[PDB]
Amino acid sequence: DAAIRGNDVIFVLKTIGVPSACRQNEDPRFVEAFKCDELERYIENNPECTLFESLRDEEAYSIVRIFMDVDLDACLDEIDYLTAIQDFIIEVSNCVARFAFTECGAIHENVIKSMRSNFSLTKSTNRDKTSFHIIFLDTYTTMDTLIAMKRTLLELSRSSENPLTRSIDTAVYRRKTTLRVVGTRKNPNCDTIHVMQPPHDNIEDYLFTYVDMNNNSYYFSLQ
Ligand SMILES: [Mg+2]
Ligand SMILES: [Mg+2]
């Protein structure tokens, strides 16, 4: 669609708690904008880095991929994890598609198809928990739409018997929100990272602000 442009510049914060003025003035001690190949190189050259992806100017442009931060503070047997991931995709796509259909004028079947057909999953290396980020690579909305969906997702987490669905962290749907970049640390005191998982090997597949639509992409927003 002519009214939808993409984004290939990834804005990252370099620590937790970056002051708003430093985001706005782009103080390089705190923030930097990268193309994906430059971001990969920065990570390789700064192995202590703690990077957090965020929208550079959400008032001007706020198209994002649907993403979830799943924070289960428990171990799962491998078979239970695999079954739960499959069920999670069904439950979450059904819930987003219903919301998109009723609140966004969306084509329900296109939300279902786009979300189920292409998503990336990280895995936290902390084996005492079941923590991951999921990005629906081909399902796009605006951040304000995700904020409007926050309570619907909260209610889904409270009604589900799936331990992963119950662990969706809905606090991430907010202005100036961040998602820690795959492969990087949270703080200088914790060495655990999220790793990529097959079949997605490219960093752009793990970024919620990277927008490169094609005919498989589906976009919806509040209407
Ligand atoms: Mg998390
Ligand atoms: Mg969280």
Numbering used by the authors: 2 to 224
Quote the paper.
Helicase E5 is a multi-domain protein; its primer synthesis and DNA unwinding activity are required for genome uncoating and DNA replication of MPXV. MPXV E5 is encoded by the E5R gene, the mature protein is 785 amino acids (aa) in length. MPXV E5 can be divided into 6 domains: the AEP domain, the ZnD domain (Zinc-binding domain), the D5N domain (a domain associated with D5-type helicases), the Linker, the SF3 Helicase domain, and the C-Tail. MPXV E5 belongs to the SF3 helicase superfamily, which normally forms hexamer and unwinds DNA with 3′- to 5′ polarity.
In addition to the AEP domain of MPXV E5, we also performed crystallization study for the AEP domain of VACV D5 and solved one structure at 1.4-Å resolution. Similar to E5 AEP, one PPi was captured in the D5 AEP structure. As revealed by structural superposition, the overall folding of E5 and D5 AEP domains are virtually identical; the RMSD value between the two domains is only 0.2 Å. These observations indicated that the folding and catalytic activity of the AEP domains are highly conserved in MPXV E5, VACV D5, and the helicases from other orthopoxvirus viruses. Identical structures indicated that the overall folding and catalytic activity of the AEP domains are conserved in MPXV E5, VACV D5, and, most likely, in all other poxviruses members.
